[PDB]
Amino acid sequence: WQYEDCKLARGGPPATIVAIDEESRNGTILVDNMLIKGTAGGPDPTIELSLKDNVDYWVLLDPVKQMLFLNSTGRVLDRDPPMNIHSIVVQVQCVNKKVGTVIYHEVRIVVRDRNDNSPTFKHESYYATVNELTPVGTTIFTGFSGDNGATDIDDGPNGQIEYVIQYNPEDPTSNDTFEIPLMLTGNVVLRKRLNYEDKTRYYVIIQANDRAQNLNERRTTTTTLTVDVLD
Ligand SMILES: [Ca+2]
Ligand SMILES: [Ca+2]
Ligand SMILES: [Ca+2]
């Protein structure tokens, strides 16, 4: 026999590691049961449980059930700029009332990024110019360089941008005449010969999408590139 109140009733490493999504509702359960040997509730508790290093009171303990809750009434657990909370580390202090001993059990909460932000274009519209003698294959727009196009505050794939020309019902030949062969630059290339005398102006719908790993979680935004033909 050893009297081991305040020890974990589990193997694995000493730290308890869990994951939640950013923007989880108030009262989200982080840990169902800490599995600390002893009884914190009731007539004669054997242990006293408390939280140390609980910066900004993001975590709350029900000591009877050894349940940890997310405390976010009137705030958002946001992983994206400007809040940038990627994890939460707190210490569950256990005091053994009978022997006067104290121990910390660490709890690492990893905050997973959600695709909660869309690509947003820096300008309402873009403009390019092409001489009608420009050869097919020539790059006629690079206006997205230096983050002058779409940006996405999410992290990793959720924040990475792909640029794709859409069919424009107001200008049907525009998506036949220009292409984005490299969807990560959004540089626009001429696909067909121009003729000032037939058409002086094109309206090119460009859609930016983020690269979320689940296709039906992807967010998208639209801009118009106006292309003017020069003679
Ligand atoms: Ca967010
Ligand atoms: Ca996010
Ligand atoms: Ca995103």
Swiss-Prot record:
Written domain comment of the UniProt record: Cadherin repeats 1 and 2 mediate calcium-dependent heterophilic interaction with CDH23. Three calcium ions are usually bound at the interface of each cadherin domain and rigidify the connections, imparting a strong curvature to the full-length ectodomain.
Which clinical disorder is mentioned?
A: Defects in Pcdh15 are the cause of the Ames waltzer (av) phenotype. It is characterized by deafness and a balance disorder, associated with the degeneration of inner ear neuroepithelia.
Q: Which residues are modified by glycosylation?
A: 26, 71, 175
Q: What is this protein's record name?
A: Protocadherin-15
The gene behind this protein is Pcdh15
Q: Where in the cell is it found?
A: Cell membrane
Subunit structure as annotated in this protein's UniProt entry: Antiparallel heterodimer with CDH23. Found in a complex with TMIE and LHFPL5. Interacts with LHFPL5/TMHS; this interaction is required for efficient localization to hair bundles. Interacts with MYO7A. Interacts with USH1G; this interaction may recruit USH1G to the plasma membrane. Interacts with TOMT. Isoforms CD1 and CD3 interact with TMC1 (via N-terminus) and TMC2 (via N-terminus). Interacts with PIEZO1.
Relate the protein's function as given in its record: Calcium-dependent cell-adhesion protein. Required for inner ear neuroepithelial cell elaboration and cochlear function. Probably involved in the maintenance of normal retinal function.
Q: Give the taxonomic lineage as stored in the record.
A: Eukaryota, Metazoa, Chordata, Craniata, Vertebrata
Cadherin domain residues are 14-121, 122-231
Range covered out of full length: 32 to 262 of 1943
Q: Which cysteines are joined by disulfide bonds?
A: 6-94
Tissues in which the UniProt entry reports expression? Expressed in brain and sensory epithelium of the developing inner ear. Expressed in the retina, in the photoreceptor inner segments, the outer plexiform layer, the inner nuclei layer and the ganglion cell layer and, more diffusely in the inner plexiform layer (at protein level). Not detected in the retinal pigment epithelium (at protein level). Expressed in the spleen, dorsal root ganglion, dorsal aspect of neural tube, floor plate and ependymal cells adjacent to the neural canal.
